[PDB]
């Protein structure tokens, strides 16, 4: 079976250089060149560049030509692809591939290399509560949330009354701006339901040994 | 180059139905034009290669068809699993270059949004700063627009949304929108507004407060 490897993720700071790397197997190396692509989140696919892993000479679209270098170890069967000088525009998705016979179409890809540029170091979140404005409880349904901001890096852990209320939750994607997370969450119950029972989020964030229990409490 | 426009950027599908696609190169290709699905978290998969060519291992749900400038991938009788991403390639010149993607989802019947809004809580504004928080939750179709107002005015900088997938259960989307402020910034102003359009829209959904109520 042929085998792109590469690992899952690097961080990096900006204005450094990383070299991310895609071991090949299952055939033989110097037989294909390797080709490289970048996928933003969201958007679609972008080719970086290939490389002759043999002879060494390159390939370079515009647009990245000097942004991204590519080199091989023959001896490790190991593509490398250097990115220099990073920005935030750079945090993306890194693919290696490895084309069919004729070199027309991408017959193999590797898992892709998530690239995060930021400056941040280890850092706990601040947890608030969200809790509705008073005076319009509305009718039917109450909606609180959880804002868990400023940590890095990821991942953080959320959950409503230690796992208990899960229906009507909705936990969204963390977002990174001046380097560092910001992630919420809404859980919607039934307006007779809260505040006389008790709502609370919970939240962890492994790397920096974080946990919160923060009760909603009407404002 | 060669560009690759792709058609529609968003198809909205239901198990069961045949549906189809379309990838136009700027200049002839031929037949060198090769499709790729994505699915969430995953990596691409080829599907069809030369514009009509099977590859072993897909099933025969999926054709390619066309020549020339005009290319066409068919999904006859679609699944669940088919709901991902799908992007064009061509080899003709040198650079291959990519289509921007026709994105799967799955249809179902428009629905409004749920719009909360939430000022800052006193534990953050006791450490300086003022995020006033609005979810928009459980819209159909995924298209929505936010503007956060301040005393009336549109406010542009300070502001982060996050979108969640297609929900797995009812096929809606939801919204976070978070306008972040200093404490002192925060406090020069009395109304906030989280104001919402959507399809579902007759008028735009206006959720608001006063500091000074």
């Known amino acids: 079976e042929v085998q792109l490897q590469q690992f899952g993720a690097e961080l990096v700071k900006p204005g450094a250089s990383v070299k991310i790397s895609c071991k090949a197997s299952g055939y033989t190396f110097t037989d294909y060149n390797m080709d490289w692509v970048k996928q933003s989140h969201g958007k679609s696919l972008q080719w970086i560049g290939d490389?002759?892993?043999?002879?060494?000479?390159?390939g370079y679209s515009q647009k990245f030509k000097g942004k991204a270098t590519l080199t091989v170890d023959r001896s490790s069967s190991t593509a490398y692809m250097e990115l220099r000088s990073l920005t935030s525009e750079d945090t993306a998705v890194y693919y290696c591939?490895?084309?069919?016979?004729?070199?027309?179409?991408?017959?193999?890809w590797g898992q892709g290399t998530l690239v995060t540029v930021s400056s941040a170091k280890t850092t706990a979140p601040s947890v608030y509560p969200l809790a509705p404005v008073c005076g319009d409880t509305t009718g039917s349904s109450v909606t609180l949330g959880c804002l868990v901001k400023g940590y890095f890096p990821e991942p953080v852990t959320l959950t409503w009354n230690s796992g208990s209320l899960s229906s009507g939750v909705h936990t969204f994607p963390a977002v990174l701006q001046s380097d560092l997370y910001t992630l919420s969450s809404s859980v919607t119950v039934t307006s007779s339901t809260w505040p006389s029972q008790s709502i609370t989020c919970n939240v962890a964030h492994p790397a920096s040994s974080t946990k919160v229990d923060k009760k909603i409490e009407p404002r | 180059e060669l560009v690759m426009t792709q058609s529609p950027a968003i198809l909205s599908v239901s198990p069961g139905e045949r549906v189809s696609f379309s990838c136009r190169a700027s200049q002839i290709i031929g037949t060198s034009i090769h499709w790729y699905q994505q699915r969430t978290n995953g990596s691409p998969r080829l599907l069809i290669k030369?514009?009509?060519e099977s590859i072993s291992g897909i099933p025969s749900r999926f054709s390619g068809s066309g020549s020339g400038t005009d290319f066409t991938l068919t999904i006859n009788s679609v699944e669940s699993d088919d709901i991902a991403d799908y992007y064009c390639?061509?080899?003709?010149?040198?650079?291959?270059?990519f289509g921007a993607g026709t994105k799967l989802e799955l249809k179902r019947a428009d629905a409004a949004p749920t719009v909360s809004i939430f000022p800052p809580s006193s534990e953050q504004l006791t450490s300086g700063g003022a995020s006033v928080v609005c979810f928009l939750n459980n819209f159909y179709p995924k298209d929505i627009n936010v503007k956060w107002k301040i005393d009336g005015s549109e406010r542009q900088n300070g502001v982060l949304n996050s979108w969640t997938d297609q929900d797995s259960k009812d096929s809606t989307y939801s919204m976070s929108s978070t306008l972040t402020l200093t404490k002192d910034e925060y406090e020069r102003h009395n109304s906030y507004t989280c104001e919402a359009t959507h399809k579902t829209s007759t008028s735009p959904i206006v959720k608001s407060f006063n500091r000074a109520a």
């Open positions: 591939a490895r084309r069919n016979y004729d070199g027309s179409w991408f017959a193999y």
């Open positions: 490389i002759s892993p043999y002879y060494g000479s390159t």
């Open positions: 030369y514009a009509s």
């Open positions: 390639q061509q080899s003709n010149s040198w650079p291959v270059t």
